[PDB]
Amino acid sequence: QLQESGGGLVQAGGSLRLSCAASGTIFYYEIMGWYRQAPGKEREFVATIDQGGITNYADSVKGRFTISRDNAKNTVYLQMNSLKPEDTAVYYCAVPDVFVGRGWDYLIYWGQGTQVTV
Amino acid sequence: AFLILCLLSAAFAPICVGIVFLGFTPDHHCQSPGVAELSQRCGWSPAEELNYTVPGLGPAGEAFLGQCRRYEVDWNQSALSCVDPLASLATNRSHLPLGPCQDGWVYDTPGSSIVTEFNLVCADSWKLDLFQSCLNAGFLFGSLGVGYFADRFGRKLCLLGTVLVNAVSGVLMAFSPNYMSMLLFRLLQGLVSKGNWMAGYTLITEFVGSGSRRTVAIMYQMAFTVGLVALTGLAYALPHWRWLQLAVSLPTFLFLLLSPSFADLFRTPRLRKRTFILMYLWFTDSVLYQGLILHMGATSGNLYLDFLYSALVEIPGAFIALITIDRVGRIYPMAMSNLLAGAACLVMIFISPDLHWLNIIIMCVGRMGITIAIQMICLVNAELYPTFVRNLGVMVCSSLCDIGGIITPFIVFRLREVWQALPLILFAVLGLLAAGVTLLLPETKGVA
């Protein structure tokens, strides 16, 4: 059971915090990530994180987004700062399948996301 | 600070391998008194001595007829033409009596070994497997008790406590008078070595965080390869097992101078199927890796070069595994690596005439294929599973793996008498079967 939160409205160069809520069973033995819908286009990719702590990022948003893991609240956070005008879409929380495909383009879960605008 | 850990790993490396150099079986034939006097009296050639005197006759087969028989005749008090001494005494093969070898055996080697010293050659050939069986039993028994001893006194005394017996036992084994004391010292030394190396692993890996842990996870394979390579140089200048053991012992002396649990892991029907497939490939790969080295160490024409070459091709396996982690899924390299192991053996069983040139190329490919398939399991383990503190479940799993490893030398050594190419069929079957099980790992319910 995945649920997203956060979102709002910003003018230019703002900052807001997102949050993905896990169930407890998928928190410890799975891999989390974040995907961007980009309406009028195919879904995009932002960042992942695993149990060890090794993180991956997209070339377009490198040096701007930061992902962190919290164990007490059983949530996965994501920080976005200095937003570009292109960054406007709904953001989904997903659990990729490692053993098939390229490792990050096959989904077995989603949470219907939430909308943000600039 | 990595120098200490590298030295400890390079010191642990020869323990599981030293049976290749300490104990080897040279060409032998038992001693028949009366031939040396005739050889010195008539000037018999030493190269052709085993052509008119050996009881093996035909070199094909005749394992018992050549190494465990004598031509019991009256060598003395007999007049011969000094051309074919047996042409008149018997005049026919199998028409004169045989018997068991009594006085002893004459070996062809400049050095010495355990087989040469204690004569484990004719009917005591099964005594050599006890050498590895005792060490594996010590490895099994050491895992259960190392946790308990570290609690009442802390980790400060235990680490210093267990690095002195490993050297004292080695020295005393180098100064052993009989066979049973060697087994006792071997078990006493093997009780603690795996625990020491496991503690050193965590001690070295404490400082490394995310990413750094992955980077230092290969330095501990590089040190193992370096230790394996540097052992071939010592065995070249010290052809006596006492000297080699005493030379590899003293370094260590100078060196010292809600929450995650196994309960949650099994009730869920998706995390229960994933581990019964992941804890079986590990067993299969460990068995194959243990067996291949012991098989190579018994039928090698030139042992010093094959053992040197079998690590310079193991080195790039970690680099390939680290290269293929980002742009390729996790089951294609595993399937390819597990498929490359079976075909190597299946070809090795079939190249009779020109095998000497092709073995150094095929066995290297097999070793590389096995080396690649082990790092992927460790990377997946690090990626997907949480940080278990310490579990009797993991302890029992390691104990069962050691139980599986105890049996292997008996099957490897004792099944080769019926047929020479029989142990190379079980390895191929296991390798080919381990490739068809990894295809059940992907989740087929709503994968896209």
Task: Kindly report the CATH number assigned to the domain that includes residue A101.
Answer: 2.60.40.10
CA A37 to chain centre: 11
Q: Which among B262, B384, B385 is the top mutation candidate for probing chain A, defined by the most A β-carbons within 10 Å of its own β-carbon?
A: B384
The first and second tokens of residue A85, run together, are 């005008």
Residue A25 with chain B: CB contacts under 8 Å = 264, 268
Q: SS3 of A8, please?
A: coil
Are A39 and A117 contacting, i.e. CB atoms less than 8 angstroms apart?
no
- List chain B domain ranges: 1-25+117-257, 28-108, 259-442
Q: Which of residues 63-92 of A touch B (CB under 8 A)?
A: none
Residue B326 with chain A: CB contacts under 8 Å = 103
* CATH topology agreement for domains B1-25+117-257 and B259-442: yes
Q: SS3 of B59, please?
A: coil
Work out the minimum CA distance from B338 to partner chain A, whole angstroms.
16
Q: For strands A65-70 and A47-49, give the pairing.
A: unpaired
- Please tell me the distance from the alpha carbon of residue B245 to that of residue B259, in angstroms, as a whole number: 48
Residue B445 with chain A: CB contacts under 8 Å = 108
- Please tell me the distance from the alpha carbon of residue B71 to that of residue B101, in angstroms, as a whole number: 10
Are B88 and B52 contacting, i.e. CB atoms less than 8 angstroms apart?
no
Q: Do A98 and B329 touch (CB under 8 A)?
A: yes
Instruction: Check residue A83 and report its DSSP letter.
Output: -
Q: Do B383 and A53 touch (CB under 8 A)?
A: no
Number of helices (H) and strands (E) in chain A: give both, helices first. Answer: 1, 9
Instruction: Check residue B15 and report its DSSP letter.
Output: G
Residue of A nearest to B444 (CA): A108
* CATH architecture under which domain B1-25+117-257 falls: Up-down Bundle (1.20)
Expressed in Å, this structure's resolution amounts to 3.3
Q: Which among A25, A26, A27, A28 is the top mutation candidate for probing chain B, defined by the most B β-carbons within 10 Å of its own β-carbon?
A: A28
Q: In what order do the strands lie in the sheet containing A75-81?
A: A3-4, A15-21, A75-81, A65-70
| Non-local CB neighbours of B246 within 8 Å, separated by 6+ positions | B171, B174
Are B437 and B338 contacting, i.e. CB atoms less than 8 angstroms apart?
no
**B304-313 CB contacts, 8 Å cutoff, 24+ apart:** B304/B232, B304/B235, B304/B236, B305/B360, B306/B359, B306/B360, B306/B363, B307/B20, B307/B232, B308/B229, B308/B232, B309/B360, B309/B364, B310/B363, B310/B364, B310/B367, B311/B225, B311/B228, B311/B229, B313/B364, B313/B365, B313/B367, B313/B368
Token pair 């680099």: residue: B319
CATH of B259-442, one of 3.10.180.10, 3.30.420.40, 1.10.10.10, 1.20.1250.20: 1.20.1250.20
Residue A101 with chain B: CB contacts under 8 Å = 329
What domain count does chain A have? Answer: 1
Q: Domain residues for A52? A: 3-115
Tell me if chain B has a CB within 8 Å of the CB of A58: no
Closest CA to B202 of B217, B187, B190: B217
Neighbours of A117 (CB within 10 A): 11
The first and second tokens of residue B205, run together, are 């890996």
Are A107 and A96 contacting, i.e. CB atoms less than 8 angstroms apart?
yes
Closest CA to B241 of B116, B104, B122: B116
Q: What are phi and psi of B162, to 5 degrees?
A: -95, 5
**Cβ-count burial of B355 within 10 angstroms (0-12 exposed, 13-18 middle, 19+ buried)?**
middle
